Amino acid sequence: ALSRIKRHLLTQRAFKEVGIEFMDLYSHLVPVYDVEPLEKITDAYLDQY
Amino acid sequence: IAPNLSIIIGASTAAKIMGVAGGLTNLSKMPACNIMLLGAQRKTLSGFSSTSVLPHTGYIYHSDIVQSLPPDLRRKAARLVAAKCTLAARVDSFHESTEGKVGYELKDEIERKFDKWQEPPPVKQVKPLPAPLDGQRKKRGGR
Amino acid sequence: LGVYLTKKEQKKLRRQTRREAQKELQEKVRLGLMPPPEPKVRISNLMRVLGTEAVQDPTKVEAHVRAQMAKRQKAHEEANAARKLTAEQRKVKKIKKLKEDISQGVHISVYRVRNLSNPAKKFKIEANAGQLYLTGVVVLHKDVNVVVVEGGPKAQKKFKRLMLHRIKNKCVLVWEGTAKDRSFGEMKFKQCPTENMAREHFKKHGAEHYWDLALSESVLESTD
Amino acid sequence: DVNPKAYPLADAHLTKKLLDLVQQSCNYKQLRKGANEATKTLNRGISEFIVMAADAEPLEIILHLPLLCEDKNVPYVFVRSKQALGRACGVSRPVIACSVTIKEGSQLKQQIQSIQQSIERLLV
Amino acid sequence: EYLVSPITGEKIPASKMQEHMRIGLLDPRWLEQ
Amino acid sequence: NIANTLMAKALQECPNSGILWSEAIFLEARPQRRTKSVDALKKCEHDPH
Amino acid sequence: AADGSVKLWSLDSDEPVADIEGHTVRVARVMWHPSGRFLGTTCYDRSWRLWDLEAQEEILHQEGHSMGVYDIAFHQDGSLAGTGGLDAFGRVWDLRTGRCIMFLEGHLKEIYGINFSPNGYHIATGSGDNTCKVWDLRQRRCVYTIPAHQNLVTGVKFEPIHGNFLLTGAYDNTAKIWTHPGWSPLKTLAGHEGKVMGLDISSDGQLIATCSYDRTFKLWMAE
Amino acid sequence: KQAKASEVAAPEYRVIVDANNLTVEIENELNIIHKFIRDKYSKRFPELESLVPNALDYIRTVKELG
Amino acid sequence: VNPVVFFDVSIGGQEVGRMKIELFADVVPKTAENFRQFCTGEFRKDGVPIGYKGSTFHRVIKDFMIQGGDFVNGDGTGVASIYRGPFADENFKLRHSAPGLLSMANSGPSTNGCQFFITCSKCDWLDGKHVVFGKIIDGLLVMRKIENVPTGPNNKPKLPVVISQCGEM
Amino acid sequence: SERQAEVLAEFERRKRARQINVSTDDSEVKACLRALGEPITLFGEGPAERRERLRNILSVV
Structure with missing residues (x-):
């Protein structure tokens, strides 16, 4: 997993389409973004680091 | 110099691709997958994604016919054109169909492929929701 | 000409034949010509298929399932053994007797070795000529071994690789070409200390040009 | 016959051996199909020979x-x-x-x- | 020309050859479907 | 062109030649040196040349 | 050329002066007559045409071979001409009667190199079966067989003065200098990077130019 | 230039070929010029090479910057 | 040669045999093309081989005419052809003065549709009004049995006389 | 009885049908069907249906 994360950090520049939805709070529409799990793990590790 | 290849694509694009390739003979000896990479500057991503840069895009990708297609249909189109362009070179380098008969015989099929790719989707019937089930249906067992 | 087929077509043809056979068996069972298939039971499958009855008399159940397994195994074995006897048969007559299709052209390779005093190399060359069914002759002279081998193209390619790599004073092919018909008989050796006797033996079959080329090659090797 | 320009044309006997060898190479993954792949292999200097067909309306493409x-x-x-x-x-x-x-x-x-x-x- | 069908073993011309293959292995359950 | 043909002939008949391969790089044009020649060349041998 | 057209060009003009047409098959060989007027053209149309300088017409379209005539070899006096086909057959036709005299049978592959001896009695025909048959015109039989190389012999020609030595060239990137009689080889001209397609000797016999398949011409002279 | 002005035995084919080789010759010499300009301007601005990948754009940029 | 068609006559559920009627494509190429499109059919209405298969004879005048082949309405008022509706007459050189000839039944000029009328006798008044689509080369006994079928009001047969199968012979 | 006999007869008839070669050329199939005496097209059937009909006719005869 760490090797894949490093490879994606070093080389990956193009990514898959991320979905968008909107939570309705009856005062504003909060965006919620759907990202692929493969990129999600890399982004989560990057955020933690 | 290259009547058929000038027929297939723009004259300016034809001149640019022969210039970068090194000659009519030099371009005719190149594989089709390489001609479309001619004049592909390594545009640096300025924080944007690689797709915004549009990499692996050559002078054929920026030609007149290729730029007249929707972006999702662009890259594929380029490849097709490149292949046919190669054929034109492989004819023009041997000085055949100087009137351009091979040029028309390739451009018409290029237009046909573009029409097929851009054709309206066919009529597809919707599946009615299956009726509720009752009784028993035999389902096998095993591993 | 025979035409091949892509792997996709091979897979589709095999799948269609297998499905045809399965449908055939199933509809044979439908019409009563065939008894319904029995479950295939092994040792692991025993307590799942015959669990309610193996407690009645386990040893009989073990015997029955082992009998079924042995029946399947022995059904597989009979055909294999019969067709392996078929292997012996052909290998000795239809799987090893080819002759390389030597009917319209005989490849003739004549080589000139410098030192061939060992009888083991001559015996190995005679065994390779008799096993590959390649005709020819061998002439011995003073630091001269003219070995001519006429036969098929695959036999000549095997003999050249055996004489150039599998046999060790140097061996070089003096004349490798094609001929209309055969000129030499069976693989035999002839010792000729004089060049006139070897030239007459080569001209008895019309192959004196090979002996002349070997003498010219020996003169060119002794000159330079 | 149909392609008089194909000076190095193989006879019927040679074509069978050629196609058998091509199929065997495909079994061993030693074959590259298409003119572009043949050109790529020639430039890479990894090919040994090229087998081409004499029937093509824009024949010069080969x-x-x-x-x-x-x-x-x-x-x-x-x-x-x-x-x-x-x-x-x-x-x-x-x-x-x-x-x-x-x-x-x-x-x-x-x-x-x-x-x-x-x-x-x-x-x- | 004349070619032998690898699935049928009959002398067939090469002009229809590829087509002879395409409708040669056509699965009858496709007709059923 | 004859030089390239001879070079190609020399590479075909005398592989694993570091000096010949390195000089063949210099025969090859700049767009065709790094893309194809050097990779197969490094695959062939790791000579100091 | 391989298009079937014969181009008669001058020694100064870069353009061909005469364009002799009439052949649709690939013209294999074209050799002028020793008298200087006629010219025999052998193509792959299983025939051999004869042209002239003052006529420029088909003098004799002598067919007869089962395959295409690869090489033609006229005599030193011009009375006979030996045309060799691609079906291992060679017909020695008469230039004064119009009939074949000798059938040069015995080869296996197609005959590529054929040249009559300047003495007027011998004829050497080289085929692609790595052999070369030297026959006698007076004895009407094959005098000897010369396996000079192991490839297809495409060039076989003796000396134009006396014919004491014969240069045999094959596709094995080497040439052999044999001899008029026993044809014992004297010189092995190696060093060619490709197959020896054509070879020729000088009128004096001091330099031999042999072209190869590596797009180069190599001369061999006495040192 | 003379061949172009003629249409405005030395056939046009050799002129076309020599022009289509001149394009590669001038491209290579322009690559040499761009390399030299990069080497010189690295003292002034050692980062514009990565920022501006195109050779001609690099030359125009250093011309407008100095 | 002229295209030959075949139609199995089924009167009352009983097969009276097949009727081989060859269409004259020389004098009527449009009627022969319409008969070839209605015999088997490839795609007429949303990919369906609609044609003369399954139709019935709606008018049977004894020793006068046997008209039918209406696949739209079934009573003889249906008009359909390969030219997307009614088409004009091909030629007036063919006459209905011979029994067994099947002409394009219509209600007037340029109204020839899927309705075909086999003349059971020589009708001089039908010459020029309708063009003969073809002639029955075989199966005249089935046409004579269908023409002698009992017909009720407005020449409507009381027994179902339909075509079970139709195609090209 | 006759039921087993007839169903078995149809069984081997179908088995014979699966093992009969029919050319893929539509023109040759049309000519063969015409020679057999049957109409080429059966109520606008498809070419595959025509080939199947020819195969069954050959099986019966």
Whole structure:
């Protein structure tokens, strides 16, 4: 997993389409973004680091 | 110099691709997958994604016919054109169909492929929701 | 000409034949010509298929399932053994007797070795000529071994690789070409200390040009 | 016959051996289909010979390969029907040009060489 | 020309050859479907 | 062109030649040196040349 | 050329002065007559045409071979001409009667190199079966067989003065200098990077130019 | 230039070929010029090479910057 | 040669045999093309082989005419052809003065549709009004049995006389 | 009885049908069907249906 994360950090520049939805709070529409799990793990590790 | 290849694509694009390739003979000896990479500057991503840069895009990708297609249909189109362009070179380098008969015989099929790719989707019937089930249906067992 | 087929077509043809056979068996069972298939039971499958009855008399159940397994195994074995006897048969007559299709052209390779005093190399060359069914002759002279081998193209390619790599004073092919018909008989050796006797033996079959080329090659090797 | 320009055209006997070798190379993954792949292999200097078909309406689309072969010292041969060549290559679609590639310690070596010799015996 | 069908073993011309293959292995359950 | 043909002939008949391969790089044009020649060349041998 | 057209060009003009047409098959060989007027053209149309300088017409379209005539070899006096086909057959036709005299049978592959001896009695025909048959015109039989190389012999020609030595060239990137009689080889001209397609000797016999398949011409002279 | 002005035995084919080789010759010499300009301007601005990948754009940029 | 068609007559559920009627494509190429499109059919209405298969004879005048082949309405008022509606007459050189000839039944000029009328006798008044689509080369006994079928009001047969199968022979 | 006999007869008839070669050329199939005496097209059937009909006719005869 760490090797894949490093490879994606070093080389990956193009990514898959991320979905968008909107939570309705009856005062504003909060965006919620759907990202692929493969990129999600890399982004989560990057955020933690 | 290259009547058929000038027929297939723009004259300016034809001149640019022969210039970068090194000659009519030099371009005719190149594989089709390489001609479309001619004049592909390594545009640096300025924080944007690689797709915004549009990499692996050559002078054929920026030609007149290729730029007249929707972006999702662009890259594929380029490849097709490149292949046919190669054929034109492989004819023009041997000085055949100087009137351009091979040029028309390739451009018409290029237009046909573009029409097929851009054709309206066919009529597809919707599946009615299956009726509720009752009784028993035999389902096998095993591993 | 025979035409091949892509792997996709091979897979589709095999799948269609297998499905045809399965449908055939199933509809044979439908019409009563065939008894319904029995479950295939092994040792692991025993307590799942015959669990309610193996407690009645386990040893009989073990015997029955082992009998079924042995029946399947022995059904597989009979055909294999019969067709392996078929292997012996052909290998000795239809799987090893080819002759390389030597009917319209005989490849003739004549080589000139410098030192061939060992009888083991001559015996190995005679065994390779008799096993590959390649005709020819061998002439011995003073630091001269003219070995001519006429036969098929695959036999000549095997003999050249055996004489150039599998046999060790140097061996070089003096004349490798094609001929209309055969000129030499069976693989035999002839010792000729004089060049006139070897030239007459080569001209008895019309192959004196090979002996002349070997003498010219020996003169060119002794000159330079 | 149909293609009088194909000077190095193989006879009926040679075509069978050629297609058998092409199929065997495809089994060993030693074959590259299509003119572009043949050109790529020739430029890489990994091919040994090229088997091309003499039936193609823009025939010159293959004519670049022989000259490049003379540049890279690689034998080339012509075949009658492109469909048969494609079937030998393992592709149902017609193929007009294919190349055979070198592998280290390949079992096909001798057969390759044999066919190579035939091509040199076919040239003039 | 004349070619032998690898699935049928009959002398068939090469002009229809590829087509002879396409409708040669056509699965009858496709007709059923 | 004859030089390239001879070079190609020399590479075909005398592989694993570091000096010949390095000089063949210099025969090859700049767009075709790094893309194809050097990779197969490094695969062939790791000579100091 | 391979298009079937014969181009008669001058020694100064870069353009061909005469364009002799009439052949659709690939013209294999074209050799002028020893008298200087006629010219025999052998193509792959299983025939051999004869042209002239003052006529420029088909003098004799002598067919007869089962395959295409590869090489033609006229006599030193011009009375006979030996045309060799691609079906291992060679017909020695008469230039004064119009009939074949000798059938040069015995070869296996197609005959590529054929040249009559300047003495007027011998004739050497080289085929692609790595052999070369030297026959006698007076004895009407094959005098000897010369396996000079192991490839297809495409060039076989003796000396134009007396014919004491014969240069045999094959596709094995080497030439052999044999001899008029026993044809014992004297010189092995190696060093060619490709197959020896054509070869020729000088009128004096001091330099031999042999072209190869590596697009180069190599001369061999006495040192 | 003379061949172009003629249409405005030395056939046009050799002129076309020599022009289509001149394009590669001038491209290579322009690559040499761009390399030299990069080497010189690395003292002034050692980062514009990565920022501006195109050679001609690099030359125009250093011309407008100095 | 002229295209030959075949139609199995089924009167009352009983097969009276097949009727081989060859269409004259020389004098009527449009009627022969319409008969070839209605015999088997490839795609007429949303990919369906609609034609003369399954139609019935709606008018049977004894020793006068046997008209039918209406696949739209079934009573003889249906008009359909390969030219997307009614088409004009091909030629007036063919006459209905011979029994067994099947002409394009219509209600007037340029109204020839899927309705075909086999003349059971020589009708001089039908010459020029309708063009003969073809002639029955075989199966005249089935046409004579269908023409002698009992017909009720407005020449409507009380027994179902339909075509079970139709195609090209 | 007759039921087993007839169903078995149809069984081997179908088995014979699966093992009969019919050309893929539509023109040759049309000519063969015309020679057999049957109409080429059965109520606008498809070419595959025509080939199947020819195969069954050959099986019966």
